[PDB]
């Protein structure tokens, strides 16, 4: 609240300093931001404690950055951490005390939890609460009565209005409890699903699962994990532990296919007990319990097919023990978020790898599903070898003179097709691919602009893939890339970042970018994170290039596009010039060649 002569807020008169400050490696700002030391001998103990109560926002190598909020604190109580259980240790760990504002905030957040509990039974949602006083003063707003369908006091609530009420209670200072007591539940018989000994659970995976299962009752929340970290395995394990009906929801045809393979590979459950509620193909969804479906079909808004209609009615009627939603970052979408209310589930676990977006709808994920249970440390995984180390880089490609003139001259937005297609980046990518091609490194180019992607591919006569590409040709190209030594590069369009199972690649060039989308960058980055059989963290075998054009709008997006990655700890190095580019022969080595491309670019319209 107090501002120094500079921008920083003043806290000299706010909180004191512990005499043994050096022993205590923890800081506590009044705003809730916390700065831990990654060099302290007791760093690990602090890391576990802070992660339990706070959600990371920046975890560079030396000094991590944690901020706590109401959602973060509620999760701590769910795992059994009381206000004194956390504040006492926080004061002990704090090297500068705890400001009263945080103290009262912690007290208010912890006490305002568990008073209101939401339980669904017999397809009816009852807002149970041991304390009756909470309900008495909770019915002041008229929305509650109209929302409601027309000790331990409970009342049934309308199915459709659950989401509206859930967000209302969050700002009402009375969060709802979504814990599932699968251990004590006889209404829905347990499913015959078991985890085979073959599956191996990594220490972070166990910790993420442990945080989800704070007590005998499973907690509904979001577990963010890298795609190469094996987030699919964790989802399977959670379903196996619940031992009740689970409805995994994908986002595309590829997503549903992989999940079924993951279930069979890691779960002993029989093949016949798994169904694919997919329009393209089905396996008698009503017949068995464990099902894999997609947001589009379940949330499909237009006319429903007769066969789908029966399945949809069957899904609505039944009650699901678990509702795994992979790629939760798309949930707050209008159609996608409707699926939450359409189906009934006790705890709706959420998995993903890039929990970031521009529109401030990510915060809704806290109430749409639950608090962010776990968010693995990408840097720590790199040290442990679970994830391939990446030498993130940003190759600056100076714009050719003529190209800039039209780019600056025109105030229209043809520039997206212009600065994405310039000779220097073309030579840069052409040179960059050539260097990696002779190094036996697998390349995965990317480009939002299909027009640029096709032009780059034909000139480099490489197997470019994109949306309307035939499925058969899509598989044929991938198989050659994985197997054929003669080919070690595939030019994938945006479809690559959506969902796929691609072979591990040593490098990932990105000539163009869709825009300032932290999702796409992290989505595309996860492709090379696939750990190799016998690599090492320090070898930096995996690389990532995000080619950009200097003095162009592309730079603004690139800096705005790397915010999420740097927060994890990745350092994006800049490369003004590439050694050996001049000696190596490359296309567009003469003014005429650039002129024809510019004319074609201008003729694009």
């Amino acid at each position: 609240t107090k501002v120094d002569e500079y921008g920083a807020k003043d806290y000299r008169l706010q909180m004191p300093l512990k005499d043994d400050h050096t022993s205590r490696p923890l800081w506590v700002a009044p705003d809730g931001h916390i700065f831990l030391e990654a060099f302290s001998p007791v760093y690990k103990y602090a890391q576990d404690f802070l992660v339990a109560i706070a959600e990371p926002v920046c975890r560079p190598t030396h000094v991590h950055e944690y901020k706590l909020t109401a959602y973060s604190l509620y999760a701590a109580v769910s795992v059994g951490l009381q206000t004194s259980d956390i504040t006492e240790y926080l004061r002990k760990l704090s090297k500068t005390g705890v400001p009263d504002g945080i103290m009262q905030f912690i007290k208010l957040c912890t006490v305002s939890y568990g008073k209101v509990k939401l339980v669904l039974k017999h397809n009816r949602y009852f807002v149970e609460s041991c304390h009756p006083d909470v309900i008495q003063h909770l019915l002041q707003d008229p929305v509650i009565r109209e929302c409601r369908l027309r000790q331990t006091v409970s009342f049934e609530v309308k199915q459709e209005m659950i989401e509206e009420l859930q967000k209302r209670c969050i700002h009402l200072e009375y969060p709802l409890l979504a814990e599932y007591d699968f251990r004590n539940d006889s209404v829905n018989p347990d499913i015959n699903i078991d985890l085979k000994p073959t599956a191996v659970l990594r220490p972070y995976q166990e910790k993420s699962l442990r945080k989800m299962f704070g007590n005998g009752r499973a907690r509904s929340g979001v577990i963010v994990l890298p795609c190469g970290a094996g987030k699919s395995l964790v989802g399977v394990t959670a379903a196996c532990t619940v031992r009740k009906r689970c409805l995994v929801l994908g986002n595309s045809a590829v997503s549903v296919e992989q999940w079924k393979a993951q279930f069979k590979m890691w779960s002993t459950i029989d093949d016949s007990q798994i169904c694919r509620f997919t329009s393209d193909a089905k396996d008698k969804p009503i017949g068995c319990s464990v099902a894999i479906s997609t947001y589009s079909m379940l949330g499909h808004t237009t006319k429903r097919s007769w066969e789908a209609e029966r399945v949809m009615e069957w899904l609505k009627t039944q009650e699901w023990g678990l509702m795994i939603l992979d790629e939760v970052h798309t949930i707050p979408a209008k159609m996608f978020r409707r699926v939450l209310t359409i189906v009934q589930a006790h705890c709706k676990l959420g998995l993903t790898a890039t929990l970031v977006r521009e529109d401030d709808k990510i915060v809704d994920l806290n109430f749409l599903i639950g608090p962010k249970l776990y968010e693995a440390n990408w840097m720590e995984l790199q040290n442990n070898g679970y994830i391939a180390k990446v030498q993130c880089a940003e190759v600056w490609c100076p714009m050719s003179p003529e190209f800039y003139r039209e780019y600056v001259a025109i105030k229209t937005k043809k520039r997206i097709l212009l600065y994405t297609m310039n000779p220097n980046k073309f030579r840069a990518c052409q040179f960059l691919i050539k260097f990696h091609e002779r190094r036996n490194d697998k390349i995965i180019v990317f480009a939002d602009n299909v027009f640029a992607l096709k032009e780059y591919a034909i000139r480099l006569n490489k197997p470019y893939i994109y949306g309307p590409t035939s499925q058969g040709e899509r598989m044929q190209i991938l198989q050659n890339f994985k197997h054929n030594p003669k080919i070690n590069t595939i030019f994938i369009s945006k479809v690559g970042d959506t969902s796929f199972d691609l072979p591990e690649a040593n490098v990932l060039i990105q000539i163009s970018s869709h825009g300032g989308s932290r999702r796409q960058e992290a989505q595309r980055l996860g492709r090379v994170l696939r750990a190799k059989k016998g690599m090492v963290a320090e070898e930096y075998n995996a690389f990532f290039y995000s080619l950009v054009s200097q003095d162009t709008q592309e730079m603004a997006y690139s800096t705005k596009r790397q915010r999420f990655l740097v927060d994890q700890g990745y350092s994006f190095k800049v490369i003004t010039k590439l050694a050996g580019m001049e000696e190596e022969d490359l296309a567009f080595s003469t003014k005429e060649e650039q002129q024809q491309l510019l004319q074609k670019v201008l003729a694009a319209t």
Binding site: D4, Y6, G7, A8, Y11, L17, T96
Partner: protein, 390 residues
């Protein structure tokens, strides 16, 4: 360096400067490797010796060390060819110099210097001294232009600010000596005192200024005896740098925070720590004032917390690379005053003028293909005079 200072002096002042007590000794330590040895050898000799002997007294290998040493001392004029006997005054004085004839202080020096820097920056609370302010103003690192308003800080002031204390102080005293002559203070008398430290009206005023900079402290109500501080004769780092342009400095002295704020945005200030971010806005702001990326990297490097000393390089490459790039963008458009030519009837005259400009150095850039060149306004008169002369 001190060698540069003594090098630019006349023979007349040099021997006078070679006072008996110390100067013959202080200038001796300066002698890097070999001149020391040669000085002692010809210290008891009253007979000059031929120049050939000195040349052949160093083996063929490392012969360069001989030439640089002889050239260095010839400027110092310790000997004369006399045809290489040493100066009798220096010989006598040196022979007289060779068998012939605390914890609180450093804190005071640390504190006194710190307050001076506080005044140097726009610190509302600082020590007031009219003599000190004007001295810095005429030192070339400050300009007021308005006695009523406190003086501001020039471009050179910021560069001086980010320098390390030894280089910062040494340069500061260097200007004092140059300005001492301008104000009329004898250079020799004041200079000799500095050497005597490492072992009149002007002296009292000179000592008063030294006492003001924190180098000395009488401690006895300005008595004749003085106890020089450590800085008179001539530490762990604290800043922690992340990979996301975030600085965590364990600074309690407001000076360090003020220095960091010059090229970064401050976010939080804890009792024993402060959080700052190195964003484009701050760095270019510092570059605009006059700083260059080298000082910031050096300043961050020198004040490097021990935690990041283990990693090599100490400063992460991205932070260093980003800082260098930000300054480069500022000077993408290099402005240089000049005068253009047009309508060259013949290239021979243009070539002849080009040769004339090259000889005089007036030319700044030339274009043979377009038959044109650019000349600075200073050389514009010279070429214009040449054109008139035909």
């Amino acid at each position: 360096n001190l060698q540069e200072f003594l090098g630019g002096l006349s023979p007349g002042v040099l021997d006078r400067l070679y006072g008996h007590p110390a100067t013959c000794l202080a200038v001796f330590r300066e002698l890097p490797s070999l001149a020391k040895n040669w000085v002692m050898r010809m210290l008891f000799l009253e007979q000059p010796l031929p120049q050939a002997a000195v040349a052949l007294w160093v083996k063929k290998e490392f012969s360069k060390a001989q030439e640089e040493s002889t050239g260095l001392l010839s400027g110092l004029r310790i000997w004369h060819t006399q045809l290489l006997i040493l100066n009798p005054i220096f010989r006598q004085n040196l022979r007289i110099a060779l068998l012939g004839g605390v914890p609180s202080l450093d804190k005071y020096a640390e504190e006194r210097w710190e307050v001076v820097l506080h005044f140097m920056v726009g610190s509302p609370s600082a020590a007031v001294s009219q003599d000190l302010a004007q001295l810095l103003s005429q030192a070339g690192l400050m300009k007021s232009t308005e006695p009523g308003e406190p003086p501001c800080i020039t471009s050179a002031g910021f560069q001086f600010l980010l320098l390390d204390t030894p280089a910062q102080l040494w340069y500061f005293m260097l200007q004092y000596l140059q300005t001492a002559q301008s104000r009329g203070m004898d250079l020799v008398e004041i200079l000799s005192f500095l050497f005597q430290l490492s072992f009149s009206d002007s002296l009292l005023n000179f000592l008063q200024h030294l006492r003001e900079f924190g180098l000395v402290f009488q401690r006895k109500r300005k008595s004749r005896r003085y106890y020089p501080t450590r800085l008179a004769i001539n530490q762990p780092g604290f800043i922690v740098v992340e990979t996301n342009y975030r600085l965590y400095a364990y600074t309690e002295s407001e000076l360090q925070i003020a220095l960091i704020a010059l090229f970064s945005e401050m976010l939080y200030r804890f009792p024993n720590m402060v959080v700052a971010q190195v964003t484009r806005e701050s760095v270019q702001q510092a570059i605009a004032s006059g700083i260059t990326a080298q000082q910031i990297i050096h300043f961050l490097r020198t004040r490097a917390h021990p935690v990041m000393l283990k990693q090599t390089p100490v400063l992460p490459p991205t932070i260093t690379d980003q800082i260098r790039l930000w300054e480069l963008e500022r000077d993408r458009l290099r402005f240089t005053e000049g005068v253009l030519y047009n309508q060259f009837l013949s290239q021979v005259d243009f070539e002849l003028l080009l040769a004339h400009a090259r000889e005089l150095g007036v030319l700044v850039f030339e274009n043979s293909a377009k038959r044109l060149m650019v000349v600075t306004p200073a050389g514009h008169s010279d070429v214009k005079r040449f054109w008139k002369r035909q």
